Design a protein around this ligand. Structure first.
Ligand SMILES: Nc1nc2[nH]cnc2c(=O)[nH]1
Ligand SMILES: Nc1nc2[nH]cnc2c(=O)[nH]1
Ligand SMILES: Nc1nc2[nH]cnc2c(=O)[nH]1
Ligand SMILES: Nc1nc2[nH]cnc2c(=O)[nH]1
Ligand SMILES: Nc1nc2[nH]cnc2c(=O)[nH]1
Ligand SMILES: Nc1nc2[nH]cnc2c(=O)[nH]1
Ligand SMILES: Nc1nc2[nH]cnc2c(=O)[nH]1
Ligand SMILES: Nc1nc2[nH]cnc2c(=O)[nH]1
Lengths: 121, 121, 120, 122, 122, 120, 121, 120
């Protein structure tokens, strides 16, 4: 089906399992794929017929910059469940949350993270 | 099956919900996947046995740079419908229309956009 | 299941529908996913149990740099058929052939190309 | 299913069939996708309800930087096996191992490598 | 002489002549070079003997994201003058302020910007 | 002293020595450094006391996408002369014109081009 | 001016004033330019007529990954004085030490750092 | 003043002190800035009034892929020395020769190399 895409959202947060990460913070990367039929809106050109990717972006921002949690799993789940709950027309959502800079990892990487898929339950 | 790929097409355009957006304009990124059996052409080396990506390119350009619409959905929808309409050989099209620079977003992102798939009817 | 991956191969060739493209040539981008079981080789660690990706690399290179063809479809199709023919161990080949610099396109793009999948 | 992602891990190693490769060594790139349910940890926010991607990273680092083998196939296989062996919770694992720099090739490429998918079979 | 470096600072502001630019806003790219002797701080390992690049960062962030101006020149001028006014130890400052996304330009570019060098004249 | 910077300008043109290049064309990359005092404008905030970078952009754009020339030297010369001729306050101009995709070159490169400095 | 060039050296270390930085560590970027006449070596092809850039790299690596300091100024100063002290043929050194990931900065940057130049004596 | 620029040239060569480096080889990155007045050619649009950067590219390629040298300094010295000797119009040459992949270094860098300037 059709989908709204929010790619490479960069936000500063305070999530982490190491106590120090929760008071120092770091950058996070977020990809969000929201499944929704966009044909009605594509034929009417009326924003009310779709869901604004700005409201989905805003929701993601509030969560990532929110209260510090220990795991990316928790934050991604929050983003996913929050998105489905706030926007009833969304059928499913895929959230990829990552840390491009992992503390104590000495060598070079792109990022380490989680990748979850959630359908309307 | 097989597919013609048009990746990272950048076009300046005036689409947007905000009034000033339709005035100033901005850059839009387009990804197009045209589903069509390419075996015939690959075994004949005759351009007439396939769809020229140049023609798909120009059709997409004309749209994106055209009369301003409010939503990316409407623009991607036109590209899909018009592509299927003009090239009967194509069986289905996937269109990804995104804005690398979303007005008012103060944080870094790659892009925000829509992603639709349309089979021939 | 398993596969050998050749990503981002760059070769200068002379393919194209416009006559001048064929005499001037240009750069082409090649991606190849060769479907072949790799567990055997993964456990013996001997070369006889797999195919050299360097052999797959050379075959594509020779084709892309070979005789000029009008379409990318023809080149990709050649790579696919040639690969399956050259290595019986291969079960399927996915070939992506693109042009990062398309003549007469006056605006920025990643590339325009083809993407075929051919099973034995 | 949910999965843990380790993308673009860069490690120096000495694998290869050519003796000069085992002497000189080179950089290897690896992507790992660990299939594992993250719902429980997503609800508890307790690191114990999941598998630390740091642990997977360090197991992978140890393998690639370890005893030199002839083929990528073999190293990718060790990574998959040891991962499954060390982390019961993980249902499957996809490992992509590649060489950005293939010796003797005069032209530019991104990388040549392997892509395997493994689960605990009989 | 020595210098603190602030490279590729990205900020969202509303500078510009065009009316639509003032309301919509856009991203701005900023490089800052601050000429200042670092030998002392490099020997005492004391943050107070040098100028914290965070303070220089904050000053610039406040300018660029602050009150709207028609020209990058004006903004660049303000950053330079304010930096020199705030930290008497800096002897000179070079500011490079650019717009990576210039409205109404149909083709691609890296950016269009200004590059000024200002030395303490007071 | 101060200068207006136009970095990484991409324009499609038909310059070149090879007859095929003239027919097909290709992308060209342009960097322009214009030395001119920005203090006055920096204090007045009036676009009138400076040079619009869009004016420089347009001049170079009309040149590169224009009539085909043989050399990058010629095109770059046109840009520099035209810029100085149009804005006397410009003390000097530096023009970097390059070709990222050079015909017949098989290996990878960033680009080949010219880099001139012109004053009055 | 003839010189040896070490560009973009990435090393993990623990420098910084914040306690969390000292604990967690982070990536550091170093560029080193070593001015020395290379004409003799360029004509003799004798390593002895030049300075091995591997020894200068190795020296820098030990410093950045070594004993933690509060300031980048200090680390850079150490690399400079040590390089000049150990390799007498070096006429002057330029050290650019930077932090690509500055803690508690919510916006994007390339990096913040120091750039120092030190001549023999 | 003016100069011809050859940026980011990637050539495969076999230079190095370690024996294995000479048998295996590696990629080398070369930047070349050749100083030469381009004013005449810029006004005449005649290739003969300038030096073709394709020839400069060719020379450099020949040297980097030729007989192995122990040091980068030696290769860059030849590149400069040979360019000045083959093209009398060049007044000076700056050669940057680097190794993006240094054997046994496992920390990630951009490159290690040399940077020399040779005047007529
Ligand atoms: N899986 C997982 N592992 C971690 N190791 C350290 N932090 C995390 C996290 O958030 N998720
Ligand atoms: N989904 C969607 N959301 C928007 N929000 C603002 N503009 C758009 C648009 O074009 N599509
Ligand atoms: N599909 C396709 N279209 C082209 N248009 C010009 N050349 C080609 C080609 O090789 N394939
Ligand atoms: N498949 C495969 N082919 C190679 N050719 C050279 N080395 C290798 C390797 O490790 N795996
Ligand atoms: N030089 C300069 N030119 C412009 N043209 C439009 N806006 C500007 C600006 O801020 N500075
Ligand atoms: N110097 C120079 N050499 C070329 N060789 C082919 N075209 C050109 C050009 O425009 N300038
Ligand atoms: N100049 C400078 N400023 C800092 N601010 C916080 N840490 C540092 C440092 O190491 N150097
Ligand atoms: N300066 C320099 N140092 C090296 N160390 C190892 N090889 C080289 C070389 O070619 N030049």
């Amino acid at each position: 089906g059709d989908k709204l895409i929010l790619k490479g959202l960069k936000f500063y947060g305070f999530h982490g399992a190491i106590a120090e990460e929760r008071t120092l913070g770091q950058m996070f990367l977020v990809d969000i794929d929201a499944w929704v039929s966009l044909k009605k809106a594509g034929e009417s050109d009326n924003l009310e017929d779709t869901i604004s990717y700005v409201d989905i972006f805003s929701l993601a921002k509030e969560i990532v910059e929110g209260s510090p949690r220990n795991l990316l799993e928790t934050v991604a789940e929050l983003i996913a469940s929050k998105t489905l709950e706030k926007f009833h027309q969304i059928n499913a959502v895929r959230v990829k949350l990552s840390k491009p800079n992992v503390a104590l990892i000495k060598s070079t990487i792109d990022y380490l993270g989680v990748d979850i898929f959630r359908q309307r339950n």
